Amino acid sequence: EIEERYQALFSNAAAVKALTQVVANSLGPKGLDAMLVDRFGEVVVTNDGVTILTLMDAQHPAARMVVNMARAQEREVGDGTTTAAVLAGALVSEGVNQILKGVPVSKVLAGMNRALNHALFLIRKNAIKVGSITDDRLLAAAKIAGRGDERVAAILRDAAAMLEDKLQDPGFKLADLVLAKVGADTTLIPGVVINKSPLWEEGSQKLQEVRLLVLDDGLYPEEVEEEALASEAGFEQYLKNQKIFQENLKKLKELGVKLILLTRGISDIAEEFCYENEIMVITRITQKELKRVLEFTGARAAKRTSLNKPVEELQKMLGYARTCFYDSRLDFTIIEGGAGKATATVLIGAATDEVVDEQERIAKDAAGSFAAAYRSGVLPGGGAFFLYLSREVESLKNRLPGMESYGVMAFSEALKVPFRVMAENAGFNGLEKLGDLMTLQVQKNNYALGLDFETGEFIDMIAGGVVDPAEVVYQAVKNASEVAISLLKINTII
Amino acid sequence: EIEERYQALFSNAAAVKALTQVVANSLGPKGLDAMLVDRFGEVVVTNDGVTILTLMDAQHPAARMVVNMARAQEREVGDGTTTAAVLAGALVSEGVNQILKGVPVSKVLAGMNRALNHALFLIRKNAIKVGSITDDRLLAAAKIAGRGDERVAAILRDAAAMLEDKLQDPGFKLADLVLAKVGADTTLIPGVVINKSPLWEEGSQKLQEVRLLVLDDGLYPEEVEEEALASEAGFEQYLKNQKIFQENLKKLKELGVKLILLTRGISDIAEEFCYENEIMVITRITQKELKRVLEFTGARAAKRTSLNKPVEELQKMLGYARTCFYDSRLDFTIIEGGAGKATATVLIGAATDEVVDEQERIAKDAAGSFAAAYRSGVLPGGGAFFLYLSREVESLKNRLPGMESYGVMAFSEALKVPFRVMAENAGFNGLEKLGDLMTLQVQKNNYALGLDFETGEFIDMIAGGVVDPAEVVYQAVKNASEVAISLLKINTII
Amino acid sequence: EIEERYQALFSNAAAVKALTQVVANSLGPKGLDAMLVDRFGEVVVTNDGVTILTLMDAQHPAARMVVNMARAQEREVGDGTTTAAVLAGALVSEGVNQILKGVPVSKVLAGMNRALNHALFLIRKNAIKVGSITDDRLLAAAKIAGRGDERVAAILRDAAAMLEDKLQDPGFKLADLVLAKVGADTTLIPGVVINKSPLWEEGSQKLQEVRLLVLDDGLYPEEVEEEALASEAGFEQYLKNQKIFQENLKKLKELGVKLILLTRGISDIAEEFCYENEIMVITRITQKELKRVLEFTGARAAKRTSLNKPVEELQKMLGYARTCFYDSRLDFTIIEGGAGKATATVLIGAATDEVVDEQERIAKDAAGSFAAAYRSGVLPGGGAFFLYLSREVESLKNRLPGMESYGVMAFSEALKVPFRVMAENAGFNGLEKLGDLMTLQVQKNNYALGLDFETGEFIDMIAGGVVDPAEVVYQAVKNASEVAISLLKINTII
Ligand SMILES: Nc1ncnc2c1ncn2[C@@H]1O[C@H](COP(=O)(O)OP(=O)(O)O)[C@@H](O)[C@H]1O
Ligand SMILES: Nc1ncnc2c1ncn2[C@@H]1O[C@H](COP(=O)(O)OP(=O)(O)O)[C@@H](O)[C@H]1O
Ligand SMILES: Nc1ncnc2c1ncn2[C@@H]1O[C@H](COP(=O)(O)OP(=O)(O)O)[C@@H](O)[C@H]1O
C-alpha cells in the first residue's frame, strides 16, 4: 500500500525505456533498424534514428518531453541526435535505480548537476581545436556524416576552404552550398546555380557584363477585381495597363538590362518583347534560389508593381553579375562574378530523382559536421570520449560528501552506455569490449582509444578517421542531461 | 454501526490530504515539479504551487474550499501561498487525530481558536521592524522572494529610497513600476516610460517644455452610420466633420504642442499635419502607461469631443513634463520632470521575448515583498519561525484546562509540518533534522536558526539573507487556520 | 523453458540472503535481537550472532554450508564470526547481481580471487604491529571484546606481561589462564589455583616447600571383581592388597609429602592415614586443572600401578611448588612458586553460579582477542577499514582487463556492507553515512575514521579505543571469501 508515492516516477520510466530500447537498435555504424506501422497499414523501415524519433506512435507525456528535446537537437546538428536521445533515456532509467534504493530525489539531482557541469567543463578543455583548414580530421568529420565517399568530403572541404573567412559568420550555413542534379559529374562551381532552362533555347549560351533584375513574382500586368471586367471602365483600366506594361518594357531596355529572373510564368507580350531585345530570361526559380542570387548579385527583390519607378530608381534595384552561362549539355544555369557576397555551389551527381534528394541531405550533415568541426573543435568518436568522461566523473564520488555522491556515480556509469550499445549492435559482448577498452584507456593514458565495429580490433579513432565536432557532443550532453533532470523533477500525475 | 456517524469527515479528510500531498512537493527552494493532465490529454509541468492548484480536477467540496482560500490569498498577498496551503492541510490532518482519539469536535475547535489568537499575538509582538529603509535585510527580503537577482534588489532599493514617501500610502503597490524589454539593461529610471518608437524616427531625440495632450482614443475624423452615408447628406456631413477636424488641428497648433499620445490610430491627414508642425506623436500605448503619464505630468485625460473646448480651457487640460527623450538605439521613450507627484520606473533586461513576460513575475514577487517589508515586519524564513511558534503554543498545554487543552496541542504540532516537508524535500531525514533543530533553537535561544536546505548545516536565516515579510505570514496563518476551522466544523453531507 | 538453467542459483541465493538478512540485524554495538523457536514452543532471544547461527532452523543446503563456515571460524578464532557471516552473504547477493546483469560466472570468480589476494595483502601490510606489549591499543583490543570491564583488560595485560615469552607456543591457549569465581575479587595470582575446599577445614591455612604427588585417579586400594568375591582366594588377595595399600601409605609418609591431588574418590583407610600425617588433600579436580598443574609443578601423572615403584621413581614423580595456601573465607586453594612451566591465573568476580559461567565466556574471548592482538597487531574496527579496502580494491577496476573487472567491483562494494548495516542498526540513514564517511576518509587520508554508533559523530577508531586484531580480520575475510567462492560455483540441483 506504499506504491503510490513512487507510482508516477515508474510510470514515466517504463515509458522512456520503452522508447530508447527501440532507438538503441539503430545506434552506431552497425546499428539495426525499425519498422513503423500506421493504422492504415502503411509501412516504413528506417535505420536512421531521427526518423523513428519522429514517426513512432508514442502518446506518453514523457516520451513527448523527450521528442521535443530531439527536435531541439536536430535544429543544431543533423548528426548525433540519436546519441543525446539514448543518453537521455539511459540517464533516466539507470538514474532512478539509485533513487529507488533509498537516495532522495533532490539530493540525487544535486549531485547530477555537479556531474553535468563538470562534464561540460572538461569537454571545453578537451575540445581539440584545429588551427588549420587542411587537416584530415575535418575531412573525416565530413566523411562520417558523408557515409565515407571521400569525393564528397574533398569537394566540400575545398569549397569551405574557398570561403574560410565567412566560416566566422553565424549568418552562414555551409550546407547551403549544395545542389544535386541527376547524372551530373560531382564537382564545384565558383558561383551560384539555377537548375533550369532559359525561356527560349538555342544551345549552350553565354552573356557578359550582366545587368540583371530579379523578381519574387511573375511577369504579368496589373490586375483589378474580376467583376470589373463586366463594367467597361474596368476594361479601360485593362487597356491602359496593357499600355503601361510595354512602356515599362522600354523602361527596361533603357538601362541596358540583359537578363531577367522570375519565380512564376511570363506573359506572351513579355516573351515577344524579350525575343526582340536579345534579353535572356529564366522562370520558376526556388525562393531559396531567389535568396541566393539576390545575395550574390547584390540586387533587390522586386515584384510587378515596382515597375512604375522612373528609371532613376531602376539603377538601384539591379544586379551585376560579371558573367553568365547556360549549359544545354548539362541543362542548367551558372551565374558568376557577383558584386555582393561571394557564395559558391557544390554539385553532386545522382542516378534517379530518388537518390538526388538524399545526396543533398548527406551533404547537409557533412557540411554541418565540417562547420562545427572547424568552429568548435573535434573529440574522438566511437563513443570513446564518453569513457574518459565516465571515470573522471566517477572521481567525484569521494571528493565531495553528502548523498549527492550517489547521484554523481549514477551519472558516471550512465556515460558508459553508448559504446556498449554500439558494440552490442555490431555483435560484440558489450561487457567484454567495454571493460577491456575502459581498462585499456587508463593503461595507455589515452582517451582516444576505441573500437572499429567491423574488425573487432581496437584502434585510435582519430587515426581511424572517426571524430565528432565539439559543439555537437557539447550541446548533446547539455540538452540530454537537462531533460533528464527535468524529467526526474516530476513527482505526480493528475 | 457507529462508523456512519463520522463518515463525512473522512470523505473530506481523505480528499484534502490527497490534495495537499501534492502541493507539499512544490514547497521550498528544492521543491519537486508536478505533471498535470486535462482530459483532452493536455499536459503541463509546474513547480510553483499556485499554478498547480488550478488545472487539478478537484470538484470535491473540501478541495474547492481550500482552492478558494489559496486563490483568495494570492489575491491579497502574492508570496507564501504554497506555505499557507500546506499549513491548512496539516491543521486538518493533524487536527482529526485528536477527534478520532476521543476529543470532541467543538472542544477541539475551541482550543484551536485560542492557539490561533496566541500565535497572532506572538507574530505581532516579535515582528522585527526595520528602522533603516536601506537595511540589507530588506534587500535580501526582495532577493529570496524575487529569485535573488542582485540587480533587481539594487534597483528596487534605489527606487524605495528615492521614493520612501509613498510607502505611507496604502493605496499604492510598488510592483507595477516594473516593465521589461528585450535585450535591455537592468537599471532605474526617474520617470515614466513607453517602450515603442514615435511616429517619425531617425535618431535619439529630446524635447524640453513638452506640451503634451493625452487621449483615450485615436486621431481620425468624426464617423457617421454606414446607412447614413447612403443619404447624400452623409457625404457632405463627412466633409463637415472633416472641416471641424481641420479646425481642431489648427486649434492644436495654436497652443505650442510638441507631443501627442494616443491609444489608437491616426488619420493620414492628421499625421501630415503633425509632420508639418514639428509635433511628436506616440500611438497605441498601454493603458497603464496612460494612467502613469497622466499622474506624472499632472495633465487630464481627454478625448476628441473635448476638442471643442475654446482653446483657453483647453490650455488647462494640457501637460508638462519638463523633459522628454526617445532613445532609438534602445527603442523606447522616457518622460521626466512632471509638475505633479514624482513617480519613477524600474527597467529590467531580457534575452528573448519568452523570458520577457516572466521577469515581471519575479519582479512582482520581489517588489511586493519589499513593499510588505517596509510596511512590516520581517521574520526568519525557511519555515523556521513556525517551530518557535509551535513550542510557544505547546506551553499552554497545562496552564489551561479542559479537553480544549488537547486541541491546542494538535495546533502546535501542525506548525512543525512546513519545516519537515522542506527537509524531506531537500532530501534530508525530516524527523531527524526537525529533532536536531528544535533542540538547537532552545540551546541557542534564537528563533532565527534554521537549516540551509542546500548545504545541510544550520544557520541564522537573517545572516543567510533569507527572510519573509511579517504581514504575509500573519494573514497566511490566519486564513489557513480559518479554512481549517470551517473544514473541521463539518459533520455530515446531503 | 530457458529459466531452468539458472534455477539452482536463485534456489541457494534466496536462502543465503535470507539468513544473513537475519544475522545482520544483530551485527554491531547497536544490533538487534531475534526470537528463535524450538518445536516444543521453546523461545529464545539472541543478540550474539553465533547463538543465532546455531539455533536457527535453516535446513537449506546453502545455509547449512554457511553454518559450516561459522563453525569453522569460531573454532579457530573466537571473535569476528558475525562479520564474516554478513560479509559472506553480501558477497553472495552482489555476486549474483552481475550474473543477472550478464557477467559469465568463471570470468567473475577467477578475478574475485585476485580481489581476495590484494585484500589479504592489504590486511598484512597495514597491520599496525605493537612492539611494546604495554601499548594502550592492546588494552583496548581486550576492551572491545570485554564488554567494557577495564578491570579484566588490565589484569589480562599485566598477566600477559608476566608471560610475554610463552605467548609463542601455539600448543598453549592464554584464555585458559582465566577462571571466574562467585563472590571473588578481580585479581591476578602468580600461580595455579584450585577452587574447592579440601577434605580438611581448619580455617585459612598455609604450607610451604610442598613435596607433592599428582594422580589422575583416586586413593582406593586395588579393586577386584564383585564376582571374584566368590573365589575365596580373592578374599585373602583382597586382604593382602589392603596391606600393601597402607604399606605404600607409609612409603609416602617417608617422603615428606604434605599434599595430595586426586581425580576420584578416597578409601577410608587412606583417609584416616592422611588425617594422621598432617597431609592436606583435594579430590575430583578438572583435567584442565590436572594438565596445567602438571605443567606448573613439574610433577608427573600417576595411577594405581605406580605404587609398586621401588622407592626410586618417587623423587622424580613429585611436584614443587614452593608455597601453597588455602583460604576458607574465600573458599579456594593457591599454589605458587613452581619449578616447571610458568602459567599464572586470572580470577574474575561474579554474582551467582549463573553469571559465573557467562563471566568466563567474556574472559575467554577477551584473552583470545588480546592474544591475537599481540600476535599480529591491530586494524581499525567500526567496520571502518573495510571501506579503505573497498576503495583500494576498486582501484583495480580499470587496472585489469577482461570481462573480469566488473566482478572485482562486486567484491569492492561487498566490503562496504558491514558499516552500512552497523549504521542502519544504530538507526542512521546508511547511505547518507556512507556518502559522508567515504568522502571524509579520502580527503583526510586516514582509514581509521569511522562512526560512533551512539552519538552520530565521527571519530578515529584507534583513538576511540575500538579495534580488531589483525589475524582475526585476516582469516575472517579469508573464510567468508572462500565460502562465497565455493558457493557460486554451483550450477544445478538433483
Ligand atoms: N563509421 C564509424 N566508425 C566508428 N564510429 C562511428 C561511425 N559512425 C558513427 N560512429 C559513432 O556513432 C556515434 C553516432 O554517430 P552519428 O554520425 O552522430 O550518428 P547519429 O547522428 O545517428 O548519432 C558517434 O559517437 C560516432 O563516434
Ligand atoms: N533559500 C532559502 N533559504 C531559506 N528559506 C527559504 C529559501 N527559499 C525558500 N525558503 C522558505 O520556503 C518558503 C518558500 O515558499 P514560498 O515563497 O512561500 O512559495 P510561494 O511563493 O509559491 O508561496 C518560504 O516560506 C521561505 O521561508
Ligand atoms: N562502541 C563501539 N564503537 C565503535 N565500533 C564498535 C563498538 N562496538 C562494536 N564496534 C564494532 O562492531 C563490530 C562488532 O562485531 P564483532 O564483535 O566482530 O561480532 P562477532 O565478533 O560476533 O563477529 C566490530 O567490528 C567493532 O569494531
Residue numbers in the entry:
A (entry chain C), B (entry chain D), C (entry chain B): 9 to 502
Paper text:
Here we describe the prototype crystal structures of the bacterial Group III CPN from Carboxydothermus hydrogenoformans (Ch-CPN), an extremely thermophilic, carbon monoxide utilizing bacterium isolated from a hot spring in Eastern Russia. The subunits of Ch-CPN assume the modular structure consisting of an equatorial domain, an intermediate domain, and an apical domain. Like Group II CPNs, Ch-CPN is a hexadecamer consisting of a doublet of octameric rings, its subunits interact between the rings in a direct rather than staggered subunit to subunit fashion, and achieve cavity closure independent of co-chaperones. The closed state with a non-hydrolyzable ATP analog and the open state with ADP represent the conformational states of Ch-CPN before and after ATP hydrolysis, respectively.
The crystal structure of the ADP-bound Ch-CPN shows its fully open conformation. Eight subunits are combined to form a short cylinder with inter-subunit interactions mediated only by the equatorial domains. The stem loop of the S1 equatorial domain is associated with the C-terminal strand of the S2 equatorial domain to form an inter-subunit β-sheet, which contrasts with the corresponding four-stranded inter-subunit β-sheet in the closed Ch-CPN. The N-terminal residues 9–13, a β-strand in the closed Ch-CPN, assume a helical conformation in the open Ch-CPN, explaining the disparity in the number of strands between the closed and open states. Two short cylinders are stacked to form a long cylinder with ~ 85 Å in height and ~ 160 Å in width. Although ADP is bound to the AMPPNP binding site, it lacks interactions with Ile152, Arg155, and Asp373 of the intermediate domain, and Asn55 and Asp56 in the stem loop compared to AMPPNP. In addition, no magnesium ion is observed despite the presence of MgCl2 in the mother liquor. Although the binding mode of the adenosine of ADP is nearly identical to that of AMPPNP, the diphosphate moiety of ADP assumes a different conformation, which in turn gives rise to different interactions. Overall, the loose binding of ADP, the product of ATP hydrolysis, facilitates the product (ADP) release to vacate the site during ATP binding, initiating a new cycle of protein folding activity. Notably, the β-sheet is the only inter-subunit contact in the open conformation, indicating that it is responsible for allosteric communication among subunits at the onset of ring closure.
